[PDB]
Amino acid sequence: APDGKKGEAGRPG
Amino acid sequence: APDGKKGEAGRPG
Amino acid sequence: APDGKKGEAGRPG
Amino acid sequence: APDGKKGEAGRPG
Amino acid sequence: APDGKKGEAGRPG
Amino acid sequence: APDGKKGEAGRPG
Amino acid sequence: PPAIPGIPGIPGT
Amino acid sequence: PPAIPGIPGIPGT
Amino acid sequence: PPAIPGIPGIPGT
Amino acid sequence: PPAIPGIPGIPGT
Amino acid sequence: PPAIPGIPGIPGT
Amino acid sequence: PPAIPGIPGIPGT
Amino acid sequence: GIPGMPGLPGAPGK
Amino acid sequence: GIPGMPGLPGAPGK
Amino acid sequence: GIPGMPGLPGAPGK
Amino acid sequence: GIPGMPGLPGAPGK
Amino acid sequence: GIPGMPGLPGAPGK
Amino acid sequence: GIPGMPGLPGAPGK
């Protein structure tokens, strides 16, 4: 069961 | 037959 | 054969 | 039946 | 074998 | 097994 | 009866 | 019972 | 006759 | 055991 | 012969 | 051997 | 029975 | 019979 | 048993 | 015979 | 055995 | 034999 990658959150500024 | 949702149009400005 | 919708081009400015 | 995640709305400003 | 379309690169400025 | 292409990172500025 | 995907919305005026 | 996809979120006010 | 996906639109001039 | 897709990330503060 | 998806384009210089 | 999708790229520093 | 996908919302003007 | 996907709309200029 | 996709998050205002 | 998907176009510079 | 999709990364703030 | 999808490219900084 090859499962997907989880995305990154954006950065502050 | 579970069918998909239709998207919204953008707003003016 | 239910085929997909083609997208719109962007507008000039 | 593994069902999908619902997206977040954007923030005001 | 109906194969997909390749995307365009962005323009300079 | 035709596998997908990996995306590019963004550039600095 | 397999399902049909939904149409994406347009950018606003 | 095959699975159903999730709804995309809206742009904020 | 299985269906074919649609082409994405271009950015405007 | 068929695979499950990953969750998309959020916009940053 | 099942079909292969297309490659996404790059951001411009 | 069915195929595996590719990883999306990150925003740049 | 396979289910369908949903669409995206457009971008606001300026 | 499997159905197809639709495309996205381009971005406006400047 | 096929699994489903997840949605995208909206864009912030101005 | 299953068909394939198409790609997205890049964003313009500045 | 069908494989899964991956997610997208969020946008930066301002 | 089903084929796979490709990824998206990130956005530039500021």
Numbering used by the authors:
A (entry chain L), B (entry chain J), C (entry chain I), D (entry chain K), E (entry chain B), F (entry chain M): 6 to 18
G (entry chain E), H (entry chain F), I (entry chain D), J (entry chain G), K (entry chain A), L (entry chain H): 7 to 19
M (entry chain O), N (entry chain N), O (entry chain P), P (entry chain C), Q (entry chain Q), R (entry chain R): 6 to 19
Manuscript text:
One of the of most well-studied defense collagens is complement component 1q (C1q) found in mammalian serum. A key feature of C1q is its “bouquet” structure, containing six flower-like C-terminal globular domains, an intermediate “branching” collagen-like region, and an N-terminal “stem” where the collagen-like portions bundle together. We have recently recapitulated the unique C1q octadecameric structure in a series of short (∼40 amino acids) synthetic peptides derived from the native sequence of the C1q stem region. Here we use a peptide self-assembly system to design collagenous assemblies based on the C1q collagen-like region.
Then we were able to determine the structure of a small narrow region of the assembly to 3.5 Å resolution from which we were able to build an atomic model. We generated a ∼ 3.5 Å resolution structure of the narrow region of the assembly which resulted in us being able to reliably model the side chains within this region. It should be noted that the molecular weight of the interpretable portion of the narrow region structure was less than 30 kDa. An interesting structural feature we identified in this model is the interweaving of hydroxyproline residues at the interface of peptide B from one PPII trimer and peptide C from another PPII trimer which evokes the “knobs-in-holes” interfaces of α-helical coiled-coils. Such an interaction could not exist in a canonical triple-helical configuration with a right-handed superhelical twist. Further examination of the model revealed that the lumen in the narrow region was dominated by rings of hydrophobic amino acids. Cross sections of the structure revealed that there were three sets of hydrophobic residues, forming rings with identical residues due to the C6 symmetry at isoleucine 7, methionine 10, and leucine 13 of peptide C. The diameter across the cavity formed by the hydrophobic rings was ∼5–6 Å. We are fairly confident in the side chain positioning of Arg16 as that is well-defined in the high-resolution narrow region model.
